[PDB]
Amino acid sequence: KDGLIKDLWPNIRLIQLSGLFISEYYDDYSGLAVLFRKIYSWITAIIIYSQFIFIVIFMVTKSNDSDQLAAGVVTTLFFTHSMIKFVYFSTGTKSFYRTLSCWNNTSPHPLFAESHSRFHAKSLSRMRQLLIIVSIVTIFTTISWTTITFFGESVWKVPDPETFNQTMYVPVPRLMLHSWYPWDSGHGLGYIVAFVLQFYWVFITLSHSNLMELLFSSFLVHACEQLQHLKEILNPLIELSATLDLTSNQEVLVRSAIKYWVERHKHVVKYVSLITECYGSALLFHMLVSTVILTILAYQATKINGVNVFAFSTIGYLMYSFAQIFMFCIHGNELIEESSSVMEAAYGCHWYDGSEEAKTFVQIVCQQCQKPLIVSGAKFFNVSLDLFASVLGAVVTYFMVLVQLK
């Protein structure tokens, strides 16, 4: 494996081991191995979807009060991100393969090979750091979710069958997720099995929902690093065309270098277009779910008081929901900035004392690289920090409106 596949090998191995519906990038293409892997992935999908169905079942059949309904809907919509992303990667592997195959046989020019290698190393460092951060965040979230179960009283509000409008607090098994099960989960082997299943489900769903965003961020990071390398080599590229005391060798070298620069920029543009094609509906669905998530979370935070399990739950849900958006918003904004600054980088070189070919190349670069490359989310909105700022402002405004009207 060479190119972007070798660039993103830890990510590919992680998603392969998670249980997602990925088939290529193997080394044991045999009938028994493919049967085992398909069986494992299907079993994982069945388990995840059955647990999700049980969770949504424990939302209408056992929730009476508006607070309980809000909590159930918050949990269901929180895991709907992973539920959507699982099926998206299940039925959309071709787009990911096409994106990963864009940088297949590209080779740096011998003159700028050192700069390309340096920027490749920088991209590797950024990708590894991002993967480490994602893994740490997911592990910490799972650990906190496991811990917070035992810090509260497992009591559920249930109306009294004897009176008319009186309720008690029935004891419930201490479980991470309030879900219904065909078998009893009060104590014993059923309790242990339910706890293990919920722990595995939470960990795996968070793993999928984080791996998808990690892949998107890694793609954007590689595009940004390629654009930065293109900006960096522009000054020596132009200085090659100086008319200092033009030979045929100099002219052909300048033409070849200009051709290589143009081909690399076209590759970057097509790569960003492939990114938009592959990750448009994912971002659209993520934002559509997160809008309702944030609305209900702001309503829940309106009734917050003191420090307790409910306060910690609302704070954690809000923090995770905002971090998930910010993770790709920052990279979209960074790509927009790095694509827009190419014009300034091109104009800031010593192009005045260059050949007519160099001046024409600079003019065409200034013409095209005028509007920034945008990773539009399903051509609905523009993924940048503007979207995150608007979301934060809307959430804060809604919280203020609720705290004023209450």
Binding site: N333, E337, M343, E344, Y347, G348, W351, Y352, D353, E356, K359, T360, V362, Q363, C366, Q367, Q370, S384, L385, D386, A389, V401, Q404, L405
Partner: protein, 319 residues
């Protein structure tokens, strides 16, 4: 240069050695007041009018603490930018406006001092840096505008002799101006964000304190702070927005002076440079900070609209 030399001396670009440590000495006096105020509500017993007044005091001293090292961070950048600005002065209108600002801030400071020494220590140190960042920005935008005018004059002179060397000099001047503008953005990105957030939070604090004012809880109370600090925030944000929006019309002068009939008499090497710089200057100089904020009168109007909507919602809820 009445206060620009002050920039230089407290920043350290000049021979002033003890004055540089005096600047850090100011960072300790405020640090003494900030920690003492933060310990008021923690341990000391006091009424409602104290901690709220202390909160305004600690919020103000938070800005004071978040301005000294906050400005000292970009020492080398400020030094290089001043060195560039040393060659050419600033417009007389900018000189007049900085003179007016520095006269008003000094005079307005004395109003609160004698309004009613133990508490007056932080009163004068607050006002100086309020004018300080409001004068540095105008001076260093005026020098940029003057250099832009010089560039336009050089281009106009170049369109009289078909002078390749003169046009190359003008292009080099434009490149240096662009680099200085990037340096200015790097320097002023952070203080502008601080001022904007300060404006927003004090607008919220004042509107809550104003709606809960006529009831009489604030007799001889925080109203003085909610007036003075709000006025300072308003004036600094207005200055920042106005002089960040003045930079949006700098490139239009070049874009309109390049379109000359002499462009049809040059020798096909002048034409390429003309077209390239026209393409570059088509996009105006945008003052983008925080990856989301464009410092201009449109941003000021957006802030005013947000404040007006908040006031309307609060009034409708009350009545």
């Amino acid at each position: 240069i009445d206060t620009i030399n002050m920039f230089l001396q407290m920043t350290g670009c000049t021979d002033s050695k003890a004055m540089l440590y005096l600047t850090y000495f100011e960072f300790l006096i405020t640090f003494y007041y900030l920690i003492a105020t933060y310990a008021s509500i923690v341990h000391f017993e006091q009424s409602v009018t104290i901690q709220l007044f202390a909160l305004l005091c600690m919020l103000i001293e938070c800005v004071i603490l978040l301005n000294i090292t906050f400005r000292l961070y970009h020492k080398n950048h400020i030094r290089e930018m001043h060195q560039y600005s040393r060659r050419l002065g600033i417009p007389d209108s900018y000189r007049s406006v900085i003179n007016v600002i520095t006269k008003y801030h000094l005079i307005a400071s004395n109003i609160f001092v004698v309004f009613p020494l133990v508490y007056a220590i932080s009163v004068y140190i607050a006002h100086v840096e309020l004018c300080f960042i409001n004068t540095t920005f105008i001076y260093y935008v005026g020098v940029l505008k003057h250099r832009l005018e010089t560039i336009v004059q050089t281009i106009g002179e170049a369109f009289a002799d078909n002078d390749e060397q003169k046009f190359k000099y003008a292009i080099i001047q434009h490149q240096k101006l662009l680099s200085y503008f990037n340096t200015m953005k790097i320097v002023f990105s952070k203080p502008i964000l601080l001022s904007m957030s300060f404006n927003a939070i004090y607008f919220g604090l004042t509107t809550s304190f104003v709606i809960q004012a006529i009831r009489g809880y604030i007799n001889q109370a925080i109203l003085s702070i909610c007036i003075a600090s709000s006025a300072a925030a308003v004036i600094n944000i207005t200055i920042y927005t106005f002089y960040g929006s003045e930079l949006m019309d700098l490139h239009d002068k070049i874009l309109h002076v390049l379109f000359d009939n002499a462009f049809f008499y040059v020798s096909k090497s002048f034409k390429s440079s003309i077209l390239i710089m026209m393409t570059r200057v088509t996009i105006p100089l945008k003052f983008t900070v925080g990856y989301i904020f464009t410092i201009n009168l449109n941003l000021l109007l957006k802030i005013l609209k947000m404040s007006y909507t908040v006031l309307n919602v609060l009034l409708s809820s009350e009545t």
